[PDB]
A paper describes a structure:
To correctly aminoacylate tRNALeu, leucyl-tRNA synthetase (LeuRS) catalyzes three reactions: activation of leucine by ATP to form leucyl-adenylate (Leu-AMP), transfer of this amino acid to tRNALeu and post-transfer editing of any mischarged product. Mechanistically similar to other adenylate-forming enzymes, the class Ia aminoacyl-tRNA synthetase (aaRS) LeuRS charges tRNALeu isoacceptors, which are essential substrates for protein translation. We have solved crystal structures for all enzymatic states of Neisseria gonorrhoeae LeuRS during Leu-AMP formation.
As the substrate-induced peptide-plane flip results from the clash with the incoming side chain of E169, we next generated a NgLeuRS-E169G mutant to investigate its corresponding effects on aminoacylation. The mutant was readily expressed and crystallized, and high-resolution structures of the NgLeuRS-E169G apo, and soaked NgLeuRS-E169G·ATP·leucinol and NgLeuRS-E169G·Leu-AMP were determined. These three structures can be fully overlaid with each other (and WT apo) with an all-atom RMSD of 0.186 Å indicating no obvious conformational changes between apo, pre-transition and intermediate states which strongly contrasts with what was observed for the WT enzyme. The interactions mediated by E169 with Y554 and W223 are thus additionally required to stabilize the closed CP1 hairpin position in the pre-transition state to promote the formation of Leu-AMP. In line with this model, independently tested amino acid activation demonstrated that substitution of E169 with a glycine results in up to fivefold increase in KM (Leu) and fourfold decrease in kcat yielding the 24-fold less efficient enzyme in Leu activation relative to the WT protein. Thus, opposite to the L550G mutant which captures the “closed conformation” and displays a defect in the aminoacyl transfer step, mutation at the CP1 hairpin which stabilizes the “open conformation” affects only the activation step.
Author numbering: 1 to 608, 618 to 814
The structure:
Amino acid sequence: MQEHYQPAAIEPAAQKKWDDARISNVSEDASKPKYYCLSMFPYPSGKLHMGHVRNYTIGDVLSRFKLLNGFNVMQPMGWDAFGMPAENAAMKNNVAPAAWTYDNIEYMKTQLKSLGFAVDWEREVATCKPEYYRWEQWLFTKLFEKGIVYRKNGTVNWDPVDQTVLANGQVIDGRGWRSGALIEKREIPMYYFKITDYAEELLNDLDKLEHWPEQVKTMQRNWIGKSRGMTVRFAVSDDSKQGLEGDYAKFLQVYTTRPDTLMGATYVAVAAEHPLATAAAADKPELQAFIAECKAGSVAEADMATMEKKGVPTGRYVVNPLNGDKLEVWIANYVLWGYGDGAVMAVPAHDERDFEFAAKYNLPKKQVIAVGDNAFDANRWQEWYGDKENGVLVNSGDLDGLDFQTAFDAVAAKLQSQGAGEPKTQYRLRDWGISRQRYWGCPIPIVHCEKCGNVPVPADQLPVVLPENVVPDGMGSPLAKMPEFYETSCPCCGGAAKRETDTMDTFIESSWYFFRYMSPKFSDGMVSAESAKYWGAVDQYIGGIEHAILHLLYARFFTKLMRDEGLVNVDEPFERLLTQGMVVCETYYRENDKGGKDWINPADVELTAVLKADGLPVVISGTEKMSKSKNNGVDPQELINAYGADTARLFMMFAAPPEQSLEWSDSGVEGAHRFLRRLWRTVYEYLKQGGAVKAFAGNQDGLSKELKDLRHKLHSTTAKVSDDYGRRQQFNTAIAAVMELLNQYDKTDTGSEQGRAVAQEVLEAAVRLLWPIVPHICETLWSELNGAKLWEAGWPTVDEAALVK
Ligand SMILES: [Mg+2]
Ligand SMILES: [Zn+2]
């Protein structure tokens, strides 16, 4: 055994030792309990960043910990290969997105292997290979025949300069974020997943997830947005029926979740596309300009509530069905066409959104709810205004004295007898649009025939192979310009027909990759029935915060879809969720000659804070998440080249808990490396003074007071580490517990015979307790202390007797 810790000399050897033993290559062995530990598979952007290393080290700790406890652990790895970054790099470097992707995959796979992750590489998948996406095309055709996937027209943002479709997040003040040209609203036929049919099932099944974070389940409930309310019809006044046709000339229909406050309605609001808005705007240019501004808006629902609410009066009036009040109709910008009736009622006294709207335009506020002896202030909103639980009705005539649910049914009874309303359940959830006007994505298995319509590609002719010999030019997506691709024959009649040129949303690949890992080479279905039965569902999921709501919802949707097709048996894909915190770092900038700032990477600077090149001082700015925005990203390959994989893994797990943000620190990295030097020195000095012995075990009566205390600290540390790994999922404190154990070991005389046995017992446990964190040095140190296989010795057991005083 060498005297000095040198990770470059032991880490390649430890990996080949695990590779030859094939401890990470697992099968459906019924003689062992299974454990599926899944980390979110990376996008092949070119090289790993710090978020990758932290995510997959967290997953490797939980995987190696469960492996030492006898579990048959599957920890797979793949590549979320589709996306736009390959197209943009293709337009910059003039290469093909496929070749650019496959090279990034090979390089990043070498980096992941160098980190020593216990990964079953025989289950590796790449979503851009036809061997993978052929099965999401298959499920598309099956759900298309059933109607779960359908085709309808939708509105998109067209950039006429870049000749591409943009999302609302890429539109700023009505212009494209790159071209700066005014976007155009176009209606094109697209494909949709009828996810609203599974809304009740997606909402109720959240109760089965006993181990999910309550805030994550709450975000799923809000996005689905189930509400039990009331449909209410306000009769249009005789002096406001001009220009209206059909039912819109008779009544204005609205939906409300607070029918107990129907007596407190002071005005109604309609969307810009509502027929009442169209009729009143026929002779009013202000209303026409307001309607045009609402239609030209490009607000994302993540910023919908942050939008300033605006409205215009119409001069048209409707009649409240309960008290007969005449209420003026307003055109509001927050009322969305397609959401319910496209019209709402307004109660400013018990809805803060209506309170701010009425206070702006000085609209009346009528109180109809009372909570105790609390005073009602018409010029200041209070939280109890919207209380549905402890409220009682006032200023409501016959409805006075009733609570929420009694007034709900009583209002329902009054409206149904008049034929002016009935209860209704609504959902904020929209259907899932999957059509993307991009090249680098999974093709849509639809052929357009003028005599047969939109016919699905039969299962024999799948996949619809995306051509890889394509270099995007920018002026339009390539698929719509390649007749050699879209010109084909109709699979129903054999006549001339055109393939679908749009590609699928990349969320589709991530909605079922956890099932493909179970049988990645299965060619008769999405997943074999044998492997799905054994592995069941993912026991532990580790990923980031980005797009968590949509990804989880889509993955839970695909699970129930595949279950209904008879492919899987579970109702939920993920039993446990661990979302890691971001990695932040300090930023550095030097002021410009044009009134700006140029941001410098931390690798090109040294703290005296001075630039590393010209030696001119550079401003050290604030800390934020590593990104190419302010050039603050630290390459983990430089961290591995300098200290090794074990130091990188240890610093990640020790600097902060997994959920908390990790702040980059050069001193913290050195401290992790010095501890690995200390651990190597401890084992080396122990073996230099006599070599290994048999670890102490059994009855400890007769040991000295000093040696009994060390065994107490030892088996107390083992209990604390097991709780940190298996329950708390707090790996930083577990490293601190082992450090305290080594501290007391240093202060203890282990020179006696039984003292050497206690020392052997202490060291054999410490290297096994840190094996999930730093497996390379622990495997190397374990072979010096004991001749058995580390994974066969298992997780260290707690000696209960070593705790009785
Ligand atoms: Mg349960
Ligand atoms: Zn045909």
